[PDB]
């Protein structure tokens, strides 16, 4: 089997992408944030504290003839940005882009933190990291991809995120028309539960490529590119007037600037992020200070190849027995 679903930016900055997901019978379609940095499929629901729902579409398990309470199971997750959610668990039929999994754990939120409430466009998350990170207790549950894997034509999914435009998540096949050149594959460590890999270096603009190993994760659920402070300083040094602002929370730059590209290495291959992808717009409406899309990871503990990086590539998440990542230009 295969599936193919369009993913759409939630706003004009590409802060996140939502993908429609069918849950239950008859289908309830929710728009979920596919997140290769986490491993829970959780949704706003009829159980979510009413004051914490503000415009999201909810899953109502009592209206699904295939829903079953997973008795005794609870979940609670905290994300790198300080947001969180928790609740109980149903199993139900879940379909993405025509690919159906029966008995998928659908984690129903009883509580969500304010950042989720405040984002009316995201009805929940669909985790695509390794199932070892799933938070359901006392019986850990499998991700949608892990449940689907055995049925797929090939044990892979691909992320093809758009710049200020829709893109595509495919399951079970690699669309050879969706990229240029060849796909370069690279080894993955699953030791932390992430799609963790090592980039071979970087370049700023037309500058020389610096060969250096940068371990990080491929994370579709993170907006920006978070890299070591040395790398990030070298990038922003090429933008007149750019500076790191502790009060704003990162590097800012004059909105009048033209940003240089940023290149990262995948083996001997190179993925070029155009400068425009690094512009996240005014820090507040009407400001002439703009927020940068490349930021330091120093306060995180891990480097993160988020959407800024991934949307410059066609990305293969190969979930074979020995997982690998593939990157192609597009």
Swiss-Prot record:
Keywords: Aspartyl protease, Disulfide bond, Hydrolase, Protease, Signal, Zymogen
Ranges in coiled-coil conformation: none
Broad class of enzyme this protein falls into: hydrolase
GO molecular function, one term: aspartic-type endopeptidase activity
The protein's Enzyme Commission number: 3.4.23.22
Keyword Mitochondrion: no
Disulfide bonds: 255-290
TM spans (from-to): none
Domain of life: Eukaryota
Active site: 35, 199
Catalysed reactions, as listed in the record: Hydrolysis of proteins with specificity similar to that of pepsin A, prefers hydrophobic residues at P1 and P1', but does not cleave 14-Ala-|-Leu-15 in the B chain of insulin or Z-Glu-Tyr. Clots milk
Claim: rRNA processing is one of the keywords in the record: no
Residues of the Peptidase A1 domain: 17-328
GO BP annotations listed: proteolysis
Family, per entry: Belongs to the peptidase A1 family.
UniProt name for this protein: Endothiapepsin
């Amino acid at each position: 089997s295969t599936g193919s679903a369009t993913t759409t930016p939630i706003d004009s900055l590409d802060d996140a992408y939502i993908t429609p997901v069918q849950i239950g019978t008859p289908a309830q379609t929710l728009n979920l944030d596919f997140d290769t940095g986490s491993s829970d499929l959780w949704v706003f629901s009829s159980e979510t504290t009413a004051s914490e729902v503000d415009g999201q579409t909810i899953y109502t398990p009592s209206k699904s003839t295939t829903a079953k309470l997973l008795s005794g199971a609870t979940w609670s997750i905290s994300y790198g940005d300080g947001s969180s959610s928790s609740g109980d668990v149903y199993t139900d039929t879940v379909s993405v882009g025509g690919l159906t999994v029966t008995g998928q754990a659908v984690e129903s939120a009883k509580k969500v933190s304010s950042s989720f409430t405040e984002d009316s466009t995201i009805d929940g998350l669909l985790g695509l990291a390794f199932s070892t990170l799933n938070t359901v207790s006392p019986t850990q549950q499998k991700t949608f991809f892990d449940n689907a894997k055995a049925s797929l034509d090939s044990p892979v999914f691909t992320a093809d995120l758009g710049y200020h435009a829709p893109g595509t998540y495919n399951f079970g096949f690699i669309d050879t028309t969706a990229y240029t050149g060849s796909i370069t594959y690279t080894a993955v460590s699953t030791k932390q539960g992430f799609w963790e890999w090592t980039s071979t270096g970087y370049a700023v603009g037309s500058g020389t490529f610096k060969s250096t190993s940068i371990d990080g994760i491929a994370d579709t659920g993170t907006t920006l590119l978070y890299l070591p402070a040395t790398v990030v300083s070298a990038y922003w040094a090429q933008v007149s007037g750019a500076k790191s602002s502790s009060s704003v929370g990162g590097y800012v730059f004059p909105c009048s600037a033209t940003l240089p590209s940023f290149t990262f290495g995948v083996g001997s291959a190179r993925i070029v992020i155009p400068g425009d992808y690094i512009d996240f717009g005014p820090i507040s409406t009407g400001s002439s200070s703009c927020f940068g899309g490349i930021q330091s990871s120093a306060g995180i503990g891990i480097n993160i190849f988020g959407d800024v990086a991934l949307k410059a590539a066609f990305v293969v998440f190969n979930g074979a027995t020995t997982p690998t990542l593939g990157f192609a230009s597009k």
